[PDB]
């Protein structure tokens, strides 16, 4: 859209102003039901050829069902919390006597339903598969005949298509040990997810956002095994809610900033330690330092608020003017001077120091820019690759407008050698 950033030379940092928050600040459970019947002994005589196939399929199905039965830089500042908390609570609710029977009875003929539980929670129940009807109307009458004589090769083949799911679901639940992330398409098909989205009690904007980005809401969801009593496989999906929608917010990148002293090892320098995302939620700001948790998709970010900071709203003031008596503006100081570079949304920041070649080149005319000293900026639509020392970075090539403001080397304000070389967590 209008992705723009303003590189401030005061402290080497890129602020990619202009995005949309779409934060995730809510959990919504949903119960997905696979119905299945309990077969007795096979009661089929004669090996034949197709009878062997049916026997293998039924044996593997029973093995799957019995296996599933036998189943039942600011990172330190973040708090911790349980992610599977709503799913386990709903499962513990389902363990109560006379509860899954409500799920089965109420969901008799429709596919989707809304029911009540012991504690009064209204969750969405959805039948995903209908193995009961197929196994009690199309296979057992054929197999239970005396002198089993399967005359239809289709019998087995379509059976495969109606067994695969109940097989491979179990497969995943045997590998991930109960909970799976992300929810695979076997656990929830795309059309199934789309149908389930438009039944949640949420506003129209939330439905539009979460229906148009099914891949991301698939990546951020959880799954958990529940009771299997009364021959009804039930598992809880944890499709995330989306409280705040369409509030402008930004991403901040930092880089080292050191003096070019001739004497090696005597160039003290500080770097801002705030890399990550800042999103304007309510009258405060929500801060995500973990850049790996935040997901990006076409100007819209999707980030879990469970790992965040409730930072005060007066944080853009520190971003604009570093030296203000209104925010401590956390930093970290060291005497290590090693060439490095970062790749922001619309350009490349270079912080190479000392005897180390620095270059920026493109595939058209080759070498275009050479960096002398200090951290510098190259816009994305001027260059294609950047290189520091002996390593090569590919700058992002997505359209946008970038403006490179002029600043001053703030570390020259400080005395040549009074700084400590000890802190990973300090402030101005």
């Amino acid at each position: 859209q209008n992705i723009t950033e303003e590189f401030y030379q005061s402290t080497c940092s890129a602020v990619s102003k202009g995005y949309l928050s779409a934060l995730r600040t809510g959990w919504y459970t949903s119960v997905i039901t696979i119905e299945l019947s309990n077969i007795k002994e096979n009661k089929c005589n004669g090996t034949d050829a197709k009878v062997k196939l049916i026997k293998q399929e039924l044996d593997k199905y029973k093995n799957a069902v019995t296996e599933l039965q036998l189943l039942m830089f600011l990172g330190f500042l973040l708090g911790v919390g349980s992610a599977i908390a709503s799913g386990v609570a709903v499962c513990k609710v389902l363990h109560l006597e006379g509860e899954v029977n409500k799920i089965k009875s109420a969901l008799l003929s429709t596919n989707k339903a809304v029911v009540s539980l012991s504690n009064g929670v209204s969750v969405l129940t959805f039948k995903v598969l209908d193995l009961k009807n197929y196994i009690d109307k199309q296979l057992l009458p054929i197999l239970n005949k005396q002198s089993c004589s399967i005359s239809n090769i289709e019998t087995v083949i379509e059976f495969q298509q109606k067994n695969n799911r109940l097989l491979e679901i179990t497969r995943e639940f045997s590998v991930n040990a109960g909970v799976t992330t992300p929810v695979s398409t076997y656990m929830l098909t795309n059309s199934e997810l789309l149908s389930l989205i438009n039944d949640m009690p949420i506003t129209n904007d939330q439905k539009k956002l979460m229906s148009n980005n099914v891949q991301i809401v698939r990546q951020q969801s959880y799954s958990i095994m529940c009771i299997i009593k009364e021959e009804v496989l039930a598992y809880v999906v944890q499709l995330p809610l989306y409280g705040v929608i369409d509030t402008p917010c930004w991403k901040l990148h930092t880089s080292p900033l050191c003096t070019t002293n001739t004497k090696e090892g005597s160039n003290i320098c500080l770097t801002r330690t705030d890399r990550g995302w800042y999103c304007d939620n309510a009258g405060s700001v929500s801060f995500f330092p973990q850049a790996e948790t935040c997901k990006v998709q076409s100007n819209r970010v999707f980030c879990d608020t469970m790992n965040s900071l409730t930072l005060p709203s007066e944080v853009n003031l520190c971003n604009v003017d570093i030296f203000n008596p209104k925010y401590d503006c956390k930093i970290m100081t060291s005497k290590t001077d090693v060439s490095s570079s970062v790749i922001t949304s619309l350009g490349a920041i270079v912080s190479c120091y000392g005897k180390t070649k620095c270059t920026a080149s493109n595939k058209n005319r080759g070498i275009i820019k050479t960096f002398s000293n200090g951290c510098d900026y190259v816009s994305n639509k001027g260059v294609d690759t950047v290189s520091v020392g002996n390593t090569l970075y590919y700058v992002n090539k997505q359209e946008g407008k970038s403006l490179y403001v002029k600043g001053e080397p703030i570390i020259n304000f400080y005395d040549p050698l009074v700084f400590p070389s000890d802190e990973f967590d300090a402030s101005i």
Partner: antibody, heavy 126, light 110 residues
């Protein structure tokens, strides 16, 4: 001591949907399954309906499907019948039946007759 | 109403044998091996005497014998008794998810 006790019946005018009730005692009820048969004077037995554990799955007869509903309430250990649009040919005695061994829905495992009941007589007249 | 054909009545002297039968089709009685024979005295509830062609319940005398052949189920007795005057019914599973009863036969002794 396995025994079934019946309730309801009598003379019913054409139409006049009548709810019929069975009962059981002396054995586990939520495990075994039940079904319902009827017999008319001068004729034989005629399959009427079948219910497995809970209201999970219900099987109906070809000549009766649609006109009849059968369900169960395990809290009161009772079995209920609702038939509407009663015709002139429903004059008969209704019998409860107990069948099945485990938690199964396939009707092939559900044809056993371990016990029977006493039946209720229902007749229509004008 | 579809049913299963059975003889109207059979009569035999005490201490003899009978060959009662009921005929169906390829998808009922003749298959699925679920043939059942039920007793009925007048004014009394029916009882299960034979199930799954030849298997027998508890408390039944060994005089009965059930079998199936082609599309016909057959019941045979030995040593007829005066209390055998009753009604016989054959019940078996039909392919279209139903349990089909017979027409009823009357057994009398002379």
């Amino acid at each position: 001591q396995v025994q079934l006790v019946e309730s309801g019946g009598g003379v019913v005018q054409p139409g006049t949907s009548l709810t019929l009730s069975c009962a059981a005692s002396g054995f586990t009820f939520r495990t075994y399954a039940f079904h319902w048969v009827r017999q008319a004077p001068g004729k034989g037995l005629e399959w009427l309906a079948l219910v497995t554990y809970d209201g999970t799955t219900q099987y109906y007869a070809d000549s009766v499907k649609g006109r009849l509903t059968i369900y169960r309430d395990n809290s009161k250990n009772t079995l209920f019948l609702h038939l509407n649009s009663l015709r002139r040919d429903d004059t008969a005695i209704y019998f409860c039946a107990r069948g099945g061994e485990g938690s199964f829905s396939w009707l092939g495992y559900l044809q056993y007759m371990d016990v029977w009941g006493q039946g209720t007589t229902v007749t229509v007249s004008s | 109403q579809s049913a299963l054909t059975q003889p109207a009545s059979v009569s035999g002297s005490p201490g003899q044998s009978i060959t009662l039968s009921c005929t169906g089709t390829s998808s009922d009685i003749g298959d699925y091996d679920y043939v059942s024979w039920y007793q009925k005295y007048p004014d009394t509830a029916p009882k299960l005497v034979i199930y799954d062609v030849s298997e027998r319940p508890s408390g039944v005398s060994t005089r009965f014998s059930g079998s199936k052949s082609g599309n016909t189920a057959s019941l045979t007795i030995s040593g007829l008794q005066p209390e055998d005057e009753a009604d016989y019914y054959c019940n078996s599973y039909s392919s279209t998810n139903t349990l089909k009863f017979g027409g009823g036969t009357k057994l009398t002794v002379l």
